[PDB]
JSON list of C-alpha atoms and ligand atoms in Angstrom, two decimals:
[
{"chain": "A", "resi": 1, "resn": "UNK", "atom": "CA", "xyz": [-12.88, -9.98, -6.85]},
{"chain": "A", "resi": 2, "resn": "UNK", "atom": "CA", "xyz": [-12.52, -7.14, -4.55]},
{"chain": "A", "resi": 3, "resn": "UNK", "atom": "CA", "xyz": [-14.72, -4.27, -5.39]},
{"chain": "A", "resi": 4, "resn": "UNK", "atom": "CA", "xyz": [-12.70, -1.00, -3.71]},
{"chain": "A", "resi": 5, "resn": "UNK", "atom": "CA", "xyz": [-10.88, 1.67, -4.76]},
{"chain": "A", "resi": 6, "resn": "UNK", "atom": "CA", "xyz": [-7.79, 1.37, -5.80]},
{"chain": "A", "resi": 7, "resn": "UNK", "atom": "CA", "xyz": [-5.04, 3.62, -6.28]},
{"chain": "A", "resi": 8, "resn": "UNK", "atom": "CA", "xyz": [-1.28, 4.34, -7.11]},
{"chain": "A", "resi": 9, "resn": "UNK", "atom": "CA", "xyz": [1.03, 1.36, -6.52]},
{"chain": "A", "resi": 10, "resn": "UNK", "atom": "CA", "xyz": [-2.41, -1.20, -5.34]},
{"chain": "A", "resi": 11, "resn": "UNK", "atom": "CA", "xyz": [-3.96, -0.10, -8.40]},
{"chain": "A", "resi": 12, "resn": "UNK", "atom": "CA", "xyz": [-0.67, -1.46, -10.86]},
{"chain": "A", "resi": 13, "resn": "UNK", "atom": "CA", "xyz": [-0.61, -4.97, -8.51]},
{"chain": "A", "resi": 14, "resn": "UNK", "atom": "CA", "xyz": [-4.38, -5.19, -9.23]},
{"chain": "A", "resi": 15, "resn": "UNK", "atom": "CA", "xyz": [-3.53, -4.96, -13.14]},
{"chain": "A", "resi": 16, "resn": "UNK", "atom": "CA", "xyz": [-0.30, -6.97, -13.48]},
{"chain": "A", "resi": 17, "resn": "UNK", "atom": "CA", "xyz": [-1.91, -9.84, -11.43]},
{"chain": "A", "resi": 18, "resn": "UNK", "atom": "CA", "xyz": [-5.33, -9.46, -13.13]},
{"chain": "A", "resi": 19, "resn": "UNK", "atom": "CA", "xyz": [-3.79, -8.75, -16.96]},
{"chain": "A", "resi": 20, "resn": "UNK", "atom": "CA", "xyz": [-1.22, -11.94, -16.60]},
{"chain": "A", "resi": 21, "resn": "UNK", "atom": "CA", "xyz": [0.65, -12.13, -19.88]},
{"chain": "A", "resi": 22, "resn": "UNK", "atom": "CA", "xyz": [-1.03, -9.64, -21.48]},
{"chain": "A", "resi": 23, "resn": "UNK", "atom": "CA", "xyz": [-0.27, -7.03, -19.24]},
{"chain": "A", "resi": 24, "resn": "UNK", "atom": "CA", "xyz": [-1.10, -3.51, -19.25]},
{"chain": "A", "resi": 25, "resn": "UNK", "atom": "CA", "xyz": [-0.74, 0.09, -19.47]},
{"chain": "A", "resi": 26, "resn": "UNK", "atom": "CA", "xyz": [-0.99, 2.70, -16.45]},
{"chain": "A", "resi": 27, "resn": "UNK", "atom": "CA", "xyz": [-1.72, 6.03, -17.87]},
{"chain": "A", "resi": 28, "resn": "UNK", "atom": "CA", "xyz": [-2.84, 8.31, -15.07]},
{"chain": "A", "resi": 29, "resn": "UNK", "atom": "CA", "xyz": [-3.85, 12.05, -15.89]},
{"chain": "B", "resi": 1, "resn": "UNK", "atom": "CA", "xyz": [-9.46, 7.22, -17.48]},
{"chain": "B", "resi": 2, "resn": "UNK", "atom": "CA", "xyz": [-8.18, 4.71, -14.82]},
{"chain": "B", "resi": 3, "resn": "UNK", "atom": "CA", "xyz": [-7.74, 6.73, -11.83]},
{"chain": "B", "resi": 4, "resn": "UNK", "atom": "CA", "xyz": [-11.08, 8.39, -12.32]},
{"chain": "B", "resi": 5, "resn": "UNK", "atom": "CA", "xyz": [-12.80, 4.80, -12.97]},
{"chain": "B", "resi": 6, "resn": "UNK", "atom": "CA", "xyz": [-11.13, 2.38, -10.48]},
{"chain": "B", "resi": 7, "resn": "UNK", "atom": "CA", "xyz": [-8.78, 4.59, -7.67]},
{"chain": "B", "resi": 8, "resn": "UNK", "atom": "CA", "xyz": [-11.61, 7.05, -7.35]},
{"chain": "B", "resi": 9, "resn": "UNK", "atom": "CA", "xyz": [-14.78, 5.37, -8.58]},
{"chain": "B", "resi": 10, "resn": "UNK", "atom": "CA", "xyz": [-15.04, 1.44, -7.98]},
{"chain": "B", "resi": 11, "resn": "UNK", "atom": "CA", "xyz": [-14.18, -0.96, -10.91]},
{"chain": "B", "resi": 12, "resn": "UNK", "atom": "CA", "xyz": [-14.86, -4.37, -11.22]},
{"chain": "B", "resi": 13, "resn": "UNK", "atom": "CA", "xyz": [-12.98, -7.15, -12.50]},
{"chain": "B", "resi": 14, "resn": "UNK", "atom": "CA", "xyz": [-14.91, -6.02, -16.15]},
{"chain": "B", "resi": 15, "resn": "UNK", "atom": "CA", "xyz": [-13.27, -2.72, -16.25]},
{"chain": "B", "resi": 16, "resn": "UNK", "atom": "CA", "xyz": [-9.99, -3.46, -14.97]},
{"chain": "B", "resi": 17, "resn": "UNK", "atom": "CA", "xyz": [-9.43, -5.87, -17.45]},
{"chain": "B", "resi": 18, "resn": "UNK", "atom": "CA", "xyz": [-10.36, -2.76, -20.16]},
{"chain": "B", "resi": 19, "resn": "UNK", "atom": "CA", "xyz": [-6.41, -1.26, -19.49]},
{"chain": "B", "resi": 20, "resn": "UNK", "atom": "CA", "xyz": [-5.01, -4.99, -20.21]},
{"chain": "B", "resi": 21, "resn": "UNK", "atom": "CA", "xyz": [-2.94, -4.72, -23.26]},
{"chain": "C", "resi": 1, "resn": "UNK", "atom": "CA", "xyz": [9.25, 10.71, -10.64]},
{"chain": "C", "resi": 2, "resn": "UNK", "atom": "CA", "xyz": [5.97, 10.44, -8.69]},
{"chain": "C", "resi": 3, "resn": "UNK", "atom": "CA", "xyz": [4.54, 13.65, -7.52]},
{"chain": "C", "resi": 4, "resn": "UNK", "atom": "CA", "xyz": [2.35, 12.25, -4.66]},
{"chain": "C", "resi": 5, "resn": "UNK", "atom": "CA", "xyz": [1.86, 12.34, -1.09]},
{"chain": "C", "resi": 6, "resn": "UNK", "atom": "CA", "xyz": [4.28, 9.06, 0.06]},
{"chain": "C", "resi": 7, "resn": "UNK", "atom": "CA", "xyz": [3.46, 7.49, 3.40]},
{"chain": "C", "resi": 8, "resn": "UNK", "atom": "CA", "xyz": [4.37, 4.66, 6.09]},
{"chain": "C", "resi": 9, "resn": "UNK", "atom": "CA", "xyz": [5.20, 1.34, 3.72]},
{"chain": "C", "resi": 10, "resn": "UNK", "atom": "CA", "xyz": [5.01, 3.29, 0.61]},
{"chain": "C", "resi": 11, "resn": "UNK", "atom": "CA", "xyz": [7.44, 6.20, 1.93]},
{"chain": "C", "resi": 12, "resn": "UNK", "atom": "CA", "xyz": [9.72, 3.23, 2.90]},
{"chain": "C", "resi": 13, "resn": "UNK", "atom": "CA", "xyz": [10.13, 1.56, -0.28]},
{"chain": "C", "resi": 14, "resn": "UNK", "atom": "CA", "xyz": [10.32, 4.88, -2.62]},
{"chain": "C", "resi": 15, "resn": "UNK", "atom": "CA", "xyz": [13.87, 5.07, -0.02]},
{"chain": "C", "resi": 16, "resn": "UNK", "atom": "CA", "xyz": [14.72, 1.83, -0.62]},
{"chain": "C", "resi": 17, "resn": "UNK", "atom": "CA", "xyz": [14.23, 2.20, -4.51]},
{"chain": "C", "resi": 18, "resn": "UNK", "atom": "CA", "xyz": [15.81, 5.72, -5.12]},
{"chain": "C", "resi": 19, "resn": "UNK", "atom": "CA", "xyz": [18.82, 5.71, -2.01]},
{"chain": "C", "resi": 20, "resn": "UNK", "atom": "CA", "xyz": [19.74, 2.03, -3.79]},
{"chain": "C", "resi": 21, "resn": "UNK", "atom": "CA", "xyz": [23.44, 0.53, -1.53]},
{"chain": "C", "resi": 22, "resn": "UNK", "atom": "CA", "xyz": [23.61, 3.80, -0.10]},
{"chain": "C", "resi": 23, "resn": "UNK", "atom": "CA", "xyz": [20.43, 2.62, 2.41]},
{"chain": "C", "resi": 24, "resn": "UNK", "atom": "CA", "xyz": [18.70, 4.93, 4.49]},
{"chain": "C", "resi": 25, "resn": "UNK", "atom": "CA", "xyz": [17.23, 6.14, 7.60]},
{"chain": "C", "resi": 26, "resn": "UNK", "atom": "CA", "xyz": [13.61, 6.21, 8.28]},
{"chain": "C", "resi": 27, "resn": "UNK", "atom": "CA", "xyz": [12.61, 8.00, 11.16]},
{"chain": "C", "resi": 28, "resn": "UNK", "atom": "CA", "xyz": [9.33, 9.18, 11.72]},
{"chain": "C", "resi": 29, "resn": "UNK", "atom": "CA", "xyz": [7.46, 10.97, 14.67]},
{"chain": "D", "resi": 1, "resn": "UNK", "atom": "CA", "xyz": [10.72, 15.09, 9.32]},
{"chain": "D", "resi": 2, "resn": "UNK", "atom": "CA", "xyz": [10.34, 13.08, 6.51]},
{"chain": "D", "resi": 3, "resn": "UNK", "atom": "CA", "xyz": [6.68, 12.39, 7.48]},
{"chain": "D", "resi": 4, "resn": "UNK", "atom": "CA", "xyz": [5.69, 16.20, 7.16]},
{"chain": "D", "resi": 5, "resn": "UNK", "atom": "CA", "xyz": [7.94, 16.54, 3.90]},
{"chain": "D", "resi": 6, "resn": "UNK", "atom": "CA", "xyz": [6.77, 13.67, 2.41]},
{"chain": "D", "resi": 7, "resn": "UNK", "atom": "CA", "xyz": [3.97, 12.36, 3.36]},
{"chain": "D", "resi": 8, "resn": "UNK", "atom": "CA", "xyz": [1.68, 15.04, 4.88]},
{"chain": "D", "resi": 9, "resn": "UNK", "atom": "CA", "xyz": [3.19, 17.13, 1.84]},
{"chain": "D", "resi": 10, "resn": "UNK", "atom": "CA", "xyz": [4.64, 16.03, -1.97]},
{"chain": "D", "resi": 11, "resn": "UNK", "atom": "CA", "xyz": [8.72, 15.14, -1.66]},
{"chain": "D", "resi": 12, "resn": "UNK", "atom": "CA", "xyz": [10.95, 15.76, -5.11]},
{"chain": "D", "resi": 13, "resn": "UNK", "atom": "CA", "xyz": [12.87, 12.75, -5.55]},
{"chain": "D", "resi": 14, "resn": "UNK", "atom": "CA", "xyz": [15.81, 14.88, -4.41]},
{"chain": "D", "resi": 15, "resn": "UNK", "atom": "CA", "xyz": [14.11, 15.96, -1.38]},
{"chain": "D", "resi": 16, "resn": "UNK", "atom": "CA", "xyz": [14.03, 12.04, -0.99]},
{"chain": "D", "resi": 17, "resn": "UNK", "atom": "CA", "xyz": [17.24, 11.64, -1.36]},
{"chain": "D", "resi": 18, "resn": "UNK", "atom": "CA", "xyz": [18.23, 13.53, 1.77]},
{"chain": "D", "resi": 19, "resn": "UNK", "atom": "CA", "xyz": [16.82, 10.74, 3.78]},
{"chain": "D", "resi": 20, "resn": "UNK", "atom": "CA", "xyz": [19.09, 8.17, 2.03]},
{"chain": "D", "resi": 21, "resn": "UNK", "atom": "CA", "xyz": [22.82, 7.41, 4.29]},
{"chain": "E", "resi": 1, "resn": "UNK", "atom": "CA", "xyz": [5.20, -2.70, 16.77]},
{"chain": "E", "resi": 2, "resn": "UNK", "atom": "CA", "xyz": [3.30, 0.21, 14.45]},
{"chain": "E", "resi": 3, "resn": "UNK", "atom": "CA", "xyz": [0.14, 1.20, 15.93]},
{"chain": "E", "resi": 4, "resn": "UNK", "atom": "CA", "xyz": [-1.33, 2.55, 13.43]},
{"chain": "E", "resi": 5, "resn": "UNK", "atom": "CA", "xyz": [-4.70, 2.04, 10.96]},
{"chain": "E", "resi": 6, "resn": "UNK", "atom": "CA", "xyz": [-3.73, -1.07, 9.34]},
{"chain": "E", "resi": 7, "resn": "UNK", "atom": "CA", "xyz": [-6.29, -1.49, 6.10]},
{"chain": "E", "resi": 8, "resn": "UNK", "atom": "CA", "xyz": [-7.06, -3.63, 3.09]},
{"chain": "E", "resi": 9, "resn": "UNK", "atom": "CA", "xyz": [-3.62, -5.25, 1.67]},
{"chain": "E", "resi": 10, "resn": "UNK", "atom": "CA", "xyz": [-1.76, -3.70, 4.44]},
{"chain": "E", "resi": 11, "resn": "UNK", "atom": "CA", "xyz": [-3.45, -5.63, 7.08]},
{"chain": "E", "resi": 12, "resn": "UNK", "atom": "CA", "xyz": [-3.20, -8.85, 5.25]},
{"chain": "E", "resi": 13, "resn": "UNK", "atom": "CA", "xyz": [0.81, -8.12, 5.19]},
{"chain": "E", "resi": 14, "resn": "UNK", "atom": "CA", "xyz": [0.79, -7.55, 8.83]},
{"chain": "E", "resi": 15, "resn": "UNK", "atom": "CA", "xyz": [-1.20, -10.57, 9.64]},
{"chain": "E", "resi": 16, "resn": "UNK", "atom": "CA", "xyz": [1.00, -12.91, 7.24]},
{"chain": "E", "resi": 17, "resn": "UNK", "atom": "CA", "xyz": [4.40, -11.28, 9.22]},
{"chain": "E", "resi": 18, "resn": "UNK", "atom": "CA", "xyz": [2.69, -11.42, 12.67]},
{"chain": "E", "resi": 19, "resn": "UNK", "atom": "CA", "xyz": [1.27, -15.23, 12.38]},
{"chain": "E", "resi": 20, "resn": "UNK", "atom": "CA", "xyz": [4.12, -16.77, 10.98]},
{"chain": "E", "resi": 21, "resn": "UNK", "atom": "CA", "xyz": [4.10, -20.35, 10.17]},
{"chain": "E", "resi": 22, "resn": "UNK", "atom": "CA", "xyz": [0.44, -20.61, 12.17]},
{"chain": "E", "resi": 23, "resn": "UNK", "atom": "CA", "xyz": [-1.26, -18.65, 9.25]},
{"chain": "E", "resi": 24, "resn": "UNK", "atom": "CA", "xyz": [-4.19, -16.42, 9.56]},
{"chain": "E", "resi": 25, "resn": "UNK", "atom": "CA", "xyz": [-7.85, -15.95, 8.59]},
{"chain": "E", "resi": 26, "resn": "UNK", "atom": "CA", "xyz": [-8.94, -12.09, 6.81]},
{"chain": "E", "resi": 27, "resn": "UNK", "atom": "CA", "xyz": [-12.68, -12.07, 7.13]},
{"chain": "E", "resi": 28, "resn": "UNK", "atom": "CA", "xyz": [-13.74, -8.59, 6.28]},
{"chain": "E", "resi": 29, "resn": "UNK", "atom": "CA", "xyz": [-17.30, -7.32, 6.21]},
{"chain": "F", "resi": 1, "resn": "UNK", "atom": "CA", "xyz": [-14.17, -7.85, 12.96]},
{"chain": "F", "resi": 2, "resn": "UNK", "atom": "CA", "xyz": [-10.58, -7.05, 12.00]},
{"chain": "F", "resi": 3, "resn": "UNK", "atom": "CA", "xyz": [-11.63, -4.04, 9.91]},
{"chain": "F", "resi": 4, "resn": "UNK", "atom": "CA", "xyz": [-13.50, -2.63, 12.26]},
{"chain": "F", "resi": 5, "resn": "UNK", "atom": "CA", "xyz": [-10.45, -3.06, 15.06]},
{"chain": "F", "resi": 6, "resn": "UNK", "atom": "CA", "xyz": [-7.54, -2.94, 13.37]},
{"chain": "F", "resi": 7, "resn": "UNK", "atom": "CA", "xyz": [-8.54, -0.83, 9.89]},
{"chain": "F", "resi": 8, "resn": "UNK", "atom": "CA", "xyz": [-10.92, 2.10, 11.48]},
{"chain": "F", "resi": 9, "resn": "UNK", "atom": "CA", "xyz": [-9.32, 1.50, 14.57]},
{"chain": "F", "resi": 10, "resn": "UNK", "atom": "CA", "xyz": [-5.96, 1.07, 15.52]},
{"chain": "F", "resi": 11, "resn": "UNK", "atom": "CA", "xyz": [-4.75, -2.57, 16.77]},
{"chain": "F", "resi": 12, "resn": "UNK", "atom": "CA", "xyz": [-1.90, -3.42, 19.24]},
{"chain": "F", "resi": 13, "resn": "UNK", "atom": "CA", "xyz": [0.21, -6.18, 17.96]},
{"chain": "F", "resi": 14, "resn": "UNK", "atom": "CA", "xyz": [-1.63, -8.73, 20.61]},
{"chain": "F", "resi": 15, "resn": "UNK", "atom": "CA", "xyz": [-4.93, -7.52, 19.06]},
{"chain": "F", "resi": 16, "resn": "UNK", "atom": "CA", "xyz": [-3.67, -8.72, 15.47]},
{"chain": "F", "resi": 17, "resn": "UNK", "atom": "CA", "xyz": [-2.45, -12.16, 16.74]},
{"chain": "F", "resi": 18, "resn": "UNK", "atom": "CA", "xyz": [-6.15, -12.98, 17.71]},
{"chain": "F", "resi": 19, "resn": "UNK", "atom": "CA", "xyz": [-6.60, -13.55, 14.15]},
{"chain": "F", "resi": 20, "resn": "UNK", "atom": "CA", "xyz": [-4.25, -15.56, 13.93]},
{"chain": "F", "resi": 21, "resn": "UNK", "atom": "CA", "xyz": [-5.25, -19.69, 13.06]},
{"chain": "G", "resi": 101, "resn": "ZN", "atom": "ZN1", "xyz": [-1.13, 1.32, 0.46]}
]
């Protein structure tokens, strides 16, 4: 897996692609 | 929380995975 | 809505998203 | 221009909106 | 064509519009 | 490599199609 940062929209794609049907919750500050 | 541990810090797969629901 | 600093493909498809059938123009410098 | 509202700086979605036709 | 810094997921877009049906290879660092 | 032309430099649509397969 990529090891970067990752931020805003990239961030959610990393999560919905990585979570599958579990998915997941964005909760920034 | 996630920004601070993955957008500015690095996270790997591990730590993503910890905001999967 | 986001509160963030918006550019090249990202500025693009917040437009796309929020102007809807209407379209819109994106001209930069 | 849109670039220097929005991108150099923070755009409201209405400010946004004056770029749609 | 943009010339502009083309990073990370961005690049991969342009290379998979640019290439076409020939494909590409992304070979970071 | 591509990064280093095209990410931290800037690459002319030619330059991109040499990574092309
Ligand atoms: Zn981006």
């Amino acid at each position: 897996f990529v090891n970067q940062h990752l931020c805003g929209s990239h961030l959610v794609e990393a999560l919905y692609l990585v979570c599958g049907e579990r998915g997941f919750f964005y909760t920034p500050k | 929380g996630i920004v601070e541990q993955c957008c500015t810090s690095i996270c790997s797969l591990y730590q993503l995975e910890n905001y999967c629901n």
